[PDB]
Amino acid sequence: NTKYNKEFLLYLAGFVDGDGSIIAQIRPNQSYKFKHQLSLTFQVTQKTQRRWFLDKLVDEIGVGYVRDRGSVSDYILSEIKPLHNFLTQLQPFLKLKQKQANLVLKIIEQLPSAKESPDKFLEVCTWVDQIAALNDSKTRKTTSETVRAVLD
Template sequence: MKEQNMNILTQTQIAYLAGFIDGDGSIIAQIVKRSDYILNYQIKVSVNFIQRKERKHFLLQFKNEVGTGTLRDRNDGITELNIVGINSVLPFLKQLQPFLRLKRKQANLVIQIIEQLPLTKNDPQKFLDLCKLADQVANLNDSKNRSISTDTVKMTFQDLGLIKK
């Protein structure tokens, strides 16, 4: 697994970013429909920071410090900094994990998902096991807009004959 070229952060920067994520951020693992994937689904991982648009400059500073991420202005007056994908999220979370308090469980689960993802390429059952971990992350985040869960993937796999009913 190739690591993203991220900037080397000081302990102070790491601790600050971890505290910011605990307060105004999220660590996400979501199951996404992907017809171009062998198993028809992907587990997408991300770390997100949010701020009011007036404080967008803080997120721009974080992006420059970390060396990766995408800024997005939402229609509700909020700006997001999103760090997406296993090659960026894994090294970032590994640095922050010891400093997280409120979102440490989510970080541990996402790290576990990323590290086990290569084992699932053609193994529907192992992929389902990781979907269960993604469901745990969603539950810890009190996710409200989730449309795909392990049960959805399991039913699809059964319909496709990838696993037994």
């Protein structure tokens, strides 16, 4: 529940609208009650020679980590509670991904009720459909419709 400096948030909001990405995914996995995991991820991609900027974010945001993948690296935050805290404070300054942010927050706020009824779970999966819609989605496979293929 760390509090972030406004100016920091202002700048980061901009940098995120540029290189950032708010992602919601439906992950097929048998070990889950409804055969799928709900996964929310905030990230920031950057050329690895500039990994330092991403490393600094780790210290500034206070959570998350940086992963390597060749010529590029990523700042990653998958932790639901800290993610909810971070986006809550970032959301008011975003402009290109403010809705995917508010959609992720709504998804988190609903997680519990969702693990209860197959319908709450599907409706939430409709939220993840909207997020992918908002982003420049191009390699998406598991949608809420595939989840609809739970009917059993």
